[PDB]
Amino acid sequence: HHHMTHHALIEAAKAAREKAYAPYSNFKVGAALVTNDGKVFHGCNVENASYGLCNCAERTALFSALAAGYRPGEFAAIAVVGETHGPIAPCGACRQVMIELGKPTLEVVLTNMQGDVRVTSAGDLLPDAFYLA
Amino acid sequence: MTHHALIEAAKAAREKAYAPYSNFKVGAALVTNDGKVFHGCNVENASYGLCNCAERTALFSALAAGYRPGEFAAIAVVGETHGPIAPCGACRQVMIELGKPTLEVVLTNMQGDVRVTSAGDLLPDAF
Amino acid sequence: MTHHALIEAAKAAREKAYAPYSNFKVGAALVTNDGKVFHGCNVENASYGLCNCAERTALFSALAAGYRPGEFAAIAVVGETHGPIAPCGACRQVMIELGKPTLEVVLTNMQGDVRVTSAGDLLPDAF
Amino acid sequence: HHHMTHHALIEAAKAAREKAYAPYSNFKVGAALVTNDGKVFHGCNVENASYGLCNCAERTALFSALAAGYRPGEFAAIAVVGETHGPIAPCGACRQVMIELGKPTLEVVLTNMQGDVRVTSAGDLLPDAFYLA
Ligand SMILES: [Zn+2]
Ligand SMILES: [Zn+2]
Ligand SMILES: [Zn+2]
Ligand SMILES: [Zn+2]
């Protein structure tokens, strides 16, 4: 992502977060996903009165990109942001989807609303991940 | 926008599906009240419970773009089913909250069979 | 087994719920055709999409014990709702597959309001 | 779990696996959970024609124990088994539920149908896990 800095991707993730639908938790999360050809996809959490139907920002971004014709392995990086003490931690469900759609080498930029950043990978977030060949 | 145009959009959406486990591609096309179209496709996962449906993919995308619950006109859904495709209960629960009971739902298949219903009709006495 | 007894079992099940996020406890009691009762409660998670409902907890438990789809007589569901509690679309999708459309569903609240329905009625033209 | 060996817990997980409802994947998984007072709960995967409603063995076992009145932190160990090359890897969704219900220190015994075993913890499976305080 020669033309996409971590700062720019975090800024897009914060912009994504503003569109969240989270009236149940009141906990807004944003994600921004940048593809192999430099296209950026926003994701936010989208809640439901039946909590089990809630969808996370990371997954919203990835599903949106897939719907646009991007395929597993076509993503350069994803940034995720929430109002947390440290850089936001993706949930396990998001990690499983990130590893399948982004591959273990997907760069994951985690941040909060206070300038705290850590850079990791989908593989590092989910060691010895489950696969079905 | 015609129902035919929306169905065609859903068919186009379907082509972009990721369904290596079921080998069963589904498409959806959601139109907003102001005329914007959002494509949705099913996106599967090795952990089956993490699979996402076309209808939900389209709705989540529209929310991510800044649309709010109740700002949608209709959704078309298509797969290679015998009759018009039947949305699963999970999709129905999401459609009713984000689309409202009055959301028009256009169900179809790859053979031209069509049924029109609403989010409310699909999920009687909803949560 | 009486409907009253099944409802009381669902109330007992409800007490064991893990719902610190919604603070809203739900119970279910599933009775098999040979008369065994399985309790279910909702079990929430910090990642909301991973929350499991009472209805599903009871059905999954019965499957894990060795019961097969279609081997169930009825399920009761209870929460502190205004009228009888309404099962979500996700539960309806699971109930129709594991219980079959003819599965009797007894919906109730903490005030004595009851409605009896079926898995098929709750999910018209199911997937 | 003084009276429950890893071997005994694995044997219970294999017995659990036999009861799986997996006509879609044809991939049966079993789990066995042992509580603080030595009670054992079986779990198996339970599939649905709409794949997003499938439930995993690990989660089936934990939800069953919760329904019996066991609470977060009341679990000593969980064994998980499937027909895999190495010890079966729990999916990310299961890891998120295991960490909340079992706590980071929950002992996780992973195995297959060919005698391969590894012992880990819920925390090790899900580093820097997501929580809501
Ligand atoms: Zn997540
Ligand atoms: Zn669906
Ligand atoms: Zn439910
Ligand atoms: Zn799992």
CA dist A14 → A24, A41, B19, C120, D108 (Å): 20, 12, 31, 44, 37
Residue B58 dihedral angles phi and psi, to the nearest 5°: -65, -50
- Residue B127 DSSP label: -
- The chains found to touch D (3+ Cβ pairs under 8 angstroms) are A, B, C
Instruction: Name residue D24's amino acid.
Output: Y
Q: What are the start-end ranges of the H helices in A26-88?
A: 57-67
Work out whether the CA dihedral D96, D98, D100, D106 comes out positive or negative: negative
- Residue A3 DSSP label: T
Ligand 2: centre distance to CA B90 (Å): 5
Question: What's the Rg (C-alpha) of chain A?
Answer: 14
CA dist B51 → B10, B73, D12, D130 (Å): 19, 26, 29, 21
Q: How far is C15 from chain B (nearest CA, A)?
A: 21
- Residue A55 DSSP label: B
- CA-to-CA distance for D20 and C60, rounded, in angstroms? 10
Q: Is D4 exposed, middle or buried (0-12, 13-18, 19+ CB in 10 A)?
A: middle
Residue reference for tokens 């994701």: A43
Work out whether the CA dihedral A32, A33, A39, A44 comes out positive or negative: negative
- CA-to-CA distance for A41 and A24, rounded, in angstroms? 24
Residue D118 dihedral angles phi and psi, to the nearest 5°: -135, 145
- CA-to-CA distance for C100 and B52, rounded, in angstroms? 24
Q: How far is D59 from chain C (nearest CA, A)?
A: 9
Q: Are D55 and C59 in contact (CB under 8 A)?
A: no
Residue D44: CB atoms within 10 A of its CB come to 28
Ligand 1: centre distance to CA D37 (Å): 33
Give B48's contacts in chain D (Cβ within 8 Å). 24-25, 47, 51-52, 54
At how many Å resolution was this determined? 1.6
CATH topology of domain B1-127: Cytidine Deaminase; domain 2 (3.40.140)
Ligand 1: centre distance to CA B3 (Å): 35
The reply, when asked if residue D94 is annotated as ligand binding, is yes
User: Domain spans of chain A?
Assistant: 1-133
- CA-to-CA distance for B113 and D43, rounded, in angstroms? 41
- CA-to-CA distance for C27 and C10, rounded, in angstroms? 5
- Pairing between β-strand C37-41 and β-strand C72-79 as defined by DSSP bridges: unpaired
Collapsing DSSP to helix, strand or coil, C118 comes out as strand
Locate the chain C residue with the closest alpha carbon to D132. C46
User: Which positions ≥6 away from C115 have C-beta within 8 Å?
Assistant: C83, C84, C106, C107, C108
Q: Are C41 and C51 in contact (CB under 8 A)?
A: no
Q: How far is D42 from chain A (nearest CA, A)?
A: 21
The reply, when asked if residue B47 is annotated as ligand binding, is yes
User: The sheet that has D29-35: what strands, in order across it?
Assistant: D40-44, D29-35, D75-82, D107-111, D117-121
From the list B38, B40, B94, the residue facing A53 with the nearest CB is B94
- Pairing between β-strand B27-32 and β-strand B37-41 as defined by DSSP bridges: antiparallel
For residue D21, the cross-strand partners are: D46
Residue B38 dihedral angles phi and psi, to the nearest 5°: -120, 125
Q: Which helix (H) or strand (E) holds A118?
A: strand A117-121
- CA-to-CA distance for C32 and C72, rounded, in angstroms? 4
User: Which positions ≥6 away from B28 have C-beta within 8 Å?
Assistant: B10, B13, B39, B40, B41, B53, B54, B55, B57, B58, B75, B76, B77, B78
Residue C8: CB atoms within 10 A of its CB come to 14
- CA-to-CA distance for C48 and A49, rounded, in angstroms? 10
Q: How far is CA A121 from the centre of its chain?
A: 12
Residue positions forming the annotated binding site of A for substrate: 45-51
Ligand 4: centre distance to CA B23 (Å): 21
Classify domain A1-133 by CATH number. 3.40.140.10
From the list A27, A97, A130, the residue facing D89 with the nearest CB is A130
Residue reference for tokens 């931690």: A89
Give C49's contacts in chain A (Cβ within 8 Å). 51-56, 91, 93
B107: its two tokens: 């169900």
From the list C86, C93, C121, the residue facing B89 with the nearest CB is C93
A94 and D92 within 8 Å at the Cβ level: the answer is: yes
- Residue D51 DSSP label: G
Q: Which helix (H) or strand (E) holds C79?
A: strand C72-79
Query: How many residues are there in chain A?
Result: 133
Q: Which helix (H) or strand (E) holds A107?
A: strand A107-111
Q: Are A130 and A98 in contact (CB under 8 A)?
A: no
Collapsing DSSP to helix, strand or coil, A127 comes out as coil
- CA-to-CA distance for B10 and A125, rounded, in angstroms? 35
Chains B–C, number of C-beta pairs less than 8 Å apart: 47
Give C127's contacts in chain D (Cβ within 8 Å). 49-50
Q: How far is CA D42 from the centre of its chain?
A: 9
- CA-to-CA distance for B89 and A48, rounded, in angstroms? 13
Query: How many residues are there in chain B?
Result: 127
Collapsing DSSP to helix, strand or coil, C37 comes out as strand
Quote the longest CA-to-CA distance of chain A: 42
B112: its two tokens: 């031209």
Q: How far is B92 from chain C (nearest CA, A)?
A: 6
Residue C16: CB atoms within 10 A of its CB come to 22
Work out whether the CA dihedral D71, D74, D80, D86 comes out positive or negative: positive
Residues of D recognised as catalytic: 58
Residue D70: CB atoms within 10 A of its CB come to 21
- CA-to-CA distance for A92 and D128, rounded, in angstroms? 10
Instruction: Name residue C48's amino acid.
Output: Y
A52 and C47 within 8 Å at the Cβ level: the answer is: no
Ligand 1: centre distance to CA C58 (Å): 25
- CA-to-CA distance for C120 and C123, rounded, in angstroms? 5
Collapsing DSSP to helix, strand or coil, A81 comes out as strand
